[PDB]
């Protein structure tokens, strides 16, 4: 029941409401109103903070508002006190040269680890965090891996007598910016969706 009131609240304030025909909802809040709005969201009855997923759109084919984007997931468990089951996402873009974000650790302690990961994997420093310390990657690791300008850092495959492979030169699969092996890719290799 509360998701409908979330939509009525955000649409009334002019925040874009993103929706795919698959049943998952995105709500993009600006940087300023982010902290206070999501505090109100927790107050709205959102027990559970599932995910903090950081995104780097540097090499995305279509342009996007900002390079980095952090998405939180707010949920209210159905089997708890008064559970509607309302689950939704909050996306907040973070500039390329301004990797800031206030934490919701004070509201949910789950953002203790999760935000650290996004600070570990991406250059995004989370404001108000108790401890922003590298979680996963080695302590001496320099950089933030999951951003596209950061190498995957592969090693060749090895064979008998000088015969080797460089997989990035071996891949027949295409990314989004890869034009393809012919002059171009159109039709079903530019995106295909069956109509049930």
């Amino acid at each position: 029941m509360r998701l409908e009131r979330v939509l009525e609240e955000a649409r009334a304030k002019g925040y874009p409401i993103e929706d795919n025909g698959l049943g998952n909802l995105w709500v993009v809040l600006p940087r300023e109103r982010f902290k206070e709005e999501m505090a109100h969201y927790k107050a709205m009855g959102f027990n559970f903070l599932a995910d903090i997923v950081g995104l780097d759109y540097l090499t995305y084919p279509d342009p996007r508002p900002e390079r980095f984007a952090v998405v939180y997931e707010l949920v209210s468990l159905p089997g708890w006190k008064d559970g509607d089951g309302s689950r939704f996402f909050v996306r907040v873009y973070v500039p390329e040269e301004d990797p800031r974000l206030p934490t919701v650790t004070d509201l949910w302690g789950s953002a203790n680890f999760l935000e650290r990961e996004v600070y570990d994997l991406f250059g995004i420093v989370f404001e108000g965090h108790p401890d922003l310390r590298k979680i996963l990657t080695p302590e001496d690791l320099e950089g933030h891996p999951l951003r596209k300008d950061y190498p995957l850092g592969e090693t060749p495959t090895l064979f008998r007598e000088g015969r080797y492979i460089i997989p990035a030169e071996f891949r027949a699969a295409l990314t989004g910016k890869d034009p393809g092996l012919t002059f171009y890719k159109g039709g079903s290799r530019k995106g295909y969706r069956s109509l049930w």
Partner: protein
């Protein structure tokens, strides 16, 4: 709940008198399923011609990229493959290989098919690149197994048994459940 200690003791004793459950490899042949992921085999047609047409569809779909295929053009007098193309060099780095079945799944001629050997433990990285003539269906045993049988003079016995070999393994000779 003092009774639980006694109940635990009693059931452990009942299992004590229950002797059997175990299988003693290598003395007892390991029971494998016919679909098991083992050492790759290259299969050949009835004509004797090899099935591999050297098309590198196995190598591209490999998530580790462990398969190497140099092609060449058949010699009409004594051809090796069925078409105009065969596999001069076929290497698979078992230290890269993760045993998917993607090379089996993508092979259009049914040449490359996983076998059943798991006894391929060796000492050296450089030696664990199993080649074409190291995987043919005609061969019976793994690299360390064949080297041990040669430096030992004693024939090869594979330590596994299966209910039957698949039709995709036409020619794969192996011990089948005890039929022999």
């Amino acid at each position: 709940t003092l009774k639980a200690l006694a109940q635990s003791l009693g059931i452990t004793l009942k299992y004590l008198f229950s002797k059997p459950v175990t299988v003693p490899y290598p003395d007892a042949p390991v029971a494998l399923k016919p679909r098991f992921h083992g050492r790759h085999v290259l299969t050949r047609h009835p004509n004797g011609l090899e099935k591999c047409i050297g098309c590198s569809l196995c190598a591209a779909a490999c998530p580790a990229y462990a398969i190497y295929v140099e092609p060449a053009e058949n010699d009409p007098e004594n051809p090796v493959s069925a078409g105009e193309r065969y596999a001069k060099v076929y290497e698979i780095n078992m230290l890269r290989c993760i045993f998917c079945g993607l090379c089996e799944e993508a092979c259009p001629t049914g040449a490359i098919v996983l076998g059943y050997d798991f006894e391929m433990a060796d000492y050296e990285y450089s030696d664990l690149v199993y080649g074409k003539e190291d995987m043919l269906v005609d061969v019976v045993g793994t690299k360390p197994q064949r080297r041990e049988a040669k430096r030992t003079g004693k024939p090869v016995k594979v330590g596994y048994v299966v209910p039957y070999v698949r039709p995709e393994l036409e020619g794969f000779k192996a011990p089948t459940e005890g039929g022999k």
